[PDB]
Amino acid sequence: ARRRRAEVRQLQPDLVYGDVLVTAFINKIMRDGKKNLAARIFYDACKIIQEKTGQEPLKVFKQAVENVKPRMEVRSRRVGGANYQVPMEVSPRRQQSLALRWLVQAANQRPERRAAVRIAHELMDAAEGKGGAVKKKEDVERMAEANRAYAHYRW
């Protein structure tokens, strides 16, 4: 984005919940342009996650994605020779994107055979405060508070 601000794409709402984060997550699950198969994955996972634990998948999804969003991260900055890892905060949009990406990548790194099962159990663990996606998030946050010695290189 040299000239413009690169206005954010406004995703379509969802047909089941009416929420936009669900459509964004379903897009993150989709591969090779199959939004139908990805939607079926997410919604069979919704049924499984609503049955195996007697809670609404809406608020569990929301609480999990909220638990995975990090508050700080590191970016490399070239200063006086080789570059250094400088910590900083995160944009809300980037927090959303990183949370959903870690969700999908930790769900597919799971042992469970079926896709919907992986999605459901990953969402459960992330909603409880544990799991792989939250582990990657807390490693991102552990990069902060560690190289905080460079807090004067914020830029």
Out of 18, 80, 92, 111, name the contact with RNA by CB under 7 A.
80
Residue 11, contacted partner among other proteins, RNA, none, CB below 5-8 A by kind: none
Please name the residues in contact with 67: beta carbons below 8 A apart, sequence gap of 6 or more.
126, 127, 129, 134, 137
Q: Which residues of 122-148 are buried (b: 16+ CB within 10 A; e: fewer)?
A: bbbbbbeeebbbbebbeebbebbeeee
Out of 18, 81, 92, 111, name the contact with RNA by CB under 7 A.
81
Nearer to RNA, 6 or 82 (CB): 82
Residue 81, contacted partner among other proteins, RNA, none, CB below 5-8 A by kind: RNA
Interface with other proteins by CB under 8 A: which residues? 148-152
Q: What is the C-alpha to C-alpha distance for residues 47 and 17, in angstroms, rounded to an integer?
A: 13
Nearer to other proteins, 8 or 149 (CB): 149
CB 54 within 8 A of CB 60: no
Quote the least distance from Cβ 147 to RNA, whole Å: 15
Tell me which H or E stretch contains 76: strand 73-77
- 149 lines the binding site for RNA (CB under 7 A): no
Site for RNA in 94-113 (CB under 7 A): none
CB 15 within 8 A of CB 42: no
Which two three-digit tokens encode residue 107?
A: 């769900």
Quote the least distance from Cβ 153 to RNA, whole Å: 13
Nearer to RNA, 33 or 81 (CB): 81
Quote the least distance from Cβ 145 to RNA, whole Å: 22
Start-end of H helices in 53-91: 57-68
User: Which residues are near RNA by CB under 7 A?
Assistant: 80-81
